[PDB]
Amino acid sequence: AQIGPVTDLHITNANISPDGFSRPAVLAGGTFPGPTIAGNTGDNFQITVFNDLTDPSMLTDTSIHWHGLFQKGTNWADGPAFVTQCPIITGQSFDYNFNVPGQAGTFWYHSHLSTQYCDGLRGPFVVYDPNDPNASLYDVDDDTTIITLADWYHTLAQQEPIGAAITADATLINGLGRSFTNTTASPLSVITVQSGKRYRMRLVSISCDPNYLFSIDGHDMTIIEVDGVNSQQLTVDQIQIFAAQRYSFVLNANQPVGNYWIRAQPNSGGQGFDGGINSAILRYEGATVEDPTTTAPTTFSNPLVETDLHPLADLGVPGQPFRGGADDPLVLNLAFANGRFSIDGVSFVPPTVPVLLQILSGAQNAQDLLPAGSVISLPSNSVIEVALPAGAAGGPHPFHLHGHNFAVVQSANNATPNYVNPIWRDTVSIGGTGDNVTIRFTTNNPGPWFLHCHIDWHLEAGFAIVFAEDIPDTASANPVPQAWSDLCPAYDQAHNIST
Ligand SMILES: *[C@@H]1O[C@H](CO)[C@@H](O[C@@H]2O[C@H](CO)[C@@H](O)[C@H](O)[C@H]2NC(C)=O)[C@H](O)[C@H]1NC(C)=O
Ligand SMILES: *[C@@H]1O[C@H](CO)[C@@H](O[C@@H]2O[C@H](CO)[C@@H](O)[C@H](O)[C@H]2NC(C)=O)[C@H](O)[C@H]1NC(C)=O
Ligand SMILES: [Cu+2]
Ligand SMILES: [Cu+2]
Ligand SMILES: [Cu+2]
Ligand SMILES: [Cu+2]
Ligand code: NA
DSSP: OOBOSEEEEEEEEEEEOTTSOOEEEEEETTBSSOOOEEEETTOEEEEEEEEOOOOGGGOSOBOEEEETOOOTTOGGGSOOBTTTBOOBOTTOEEEEEEEOTTOOEEEEEEEOSTTGGGGTOEEEEEEEOTTOTTGGGOSBOSGGGEEEEEEEOSSOGGGSOTTSOOOOSEEEETTBOOBSSSOOOOOOOEEEEOTTOEEEEEEEEOOSSOOEEEEETTOOEEEEEETTEEEEEEEESBEEEOTTOEEEEEEEOOSOSSEEEEEEEESSSOOSOGGGTTEEEEEETTOOSSOOOOOOOSSOSSBOOGGGOOBSSOOOOSSOSSTTOSSEEEEOOEEEETTEEEETTBOOOOOSSOHHHHHHTTOOSGGGSSSTTSEEEEOTTOEEEEEOOOOSSSOSOEEEETTOOEEEEEOTTOOOOOSSSOOEESEEEOOSTTOOOEEEEEOOSOEEEEEEESSHHHHHTTOEEEEEETHHHHHHHOOOOHHHHTHHHHHHHHTTOOO
């Protein structure tokens, strides 16, 4: 069952064995992935998060981010530790009370403390549209049509060296999959369809790092949503999905009744499908209960290319149709050396006082804010352009902006910008050497918004900056509840921190 929009959510430690290997984890709702949190567009969500964690090897504090939800007027509820709140301590709870006006689509939630979401605190978050403009394109859209793709590690996150190339031990599809080494024939996930029906498959990357080449043998996929943004229909036979991205696609159950492999090949870790790694099963009702015998093609003839995507609505692009054609045009210098990432020469290390609390306490320019050099102010009601030229080691880096979606004016592997009709999204691969992926948005959401690579190991190694959007209006726009004001005193007392 789905939970929400008003629900408790307990965060616990437990042993799990999603690939046959037992390890302890950090779980929401007792499962991996966590339960789907759902509601309708414009609903009030009140997710009261109970921190019941006791195992220090995965951290006993926590904080949860609602990925892709704008949090307008509720910056305090966004979740990134030391940007919008101090962590919740064990034995305490916290009500994330916010609204989702003007958004409908496929989202997710995850820990936003250190690399803790890798240890298991990740699940889907779906905002349905009762008047969806795509409703007539499918018959079925429910918890059974969500497909999660996850990397899974046998080593605990807090034992992963910072700045290292860290590699997973299994790909999990809907929570199940097989280990790359010492492979055992542990259970594979089954997605069941009825011959003749059309399904809205909601594909969610809950990855901490790899991108996946996702396909379904015998089937093609008609994209209708990208990171929450409705798209024109685009039919493909393969989707390369980067960490934290989401797609909805229509699956037409139009092939013979039978069993078909679902494939998710990561860019690192185990390559191929030997022993049923990187796999799940699409089963038609009435098929024999047995593994598929289907083949992938040698090459995919209609892969997703990001410039082929276009919004369903006439979203356009803000600003003027040339590089630098914005009120505030920025170019970030994105680098890596010696185990640490940097943006504009500064490696991100979380501050002691969350950025939002520094601003509410009266710090009002970005040079007054900590960490020094890690906060860039944005002016209000302005067109922002951010160029993100690639080249830093460990790519391709999927960059994500909190509080906003953005027009993808230039995509990976294509030097031509699009000032007319590019897709809007919230997490974008910045590509490869020489690329110049560029995003645009308008500043209508006061508060401090994190910008970072969504490979969680990279964020931990410093690949982040904070956009302090409309500092002067942050306090009036974002009134804070007493429980939020209580978080830093409680956290600092528990950890013997003076501030
Ligand atoms: C990416 O595009 C940005 C513009 O969006 C380029 O920025 C210019 O950089 C040159 C020096 O490299 C400066 O003289 C200009 O002031 C910048 N802004 C402009 C022209 O509008 C950046 O060079 C591009 N990077 C790559 C690798 O192609
Ligand atoms: C590279 O990106 C550009 C810009 O998004 C793509 O160019 C568009 O191509 C479409 C489809 O043919 C045309 O309708 C548009 O007029 C083009 N726009 C511009 C500004 O040129 C281009 O197709 C992409 N390249 C590849 C190989 O997909
Ligand atoms: Cu996220
Ligand atoms: Cu986010
Ligand atoms: Cu990265
Ligand atoms: Cu984030
Ligand atoms: Na425009």
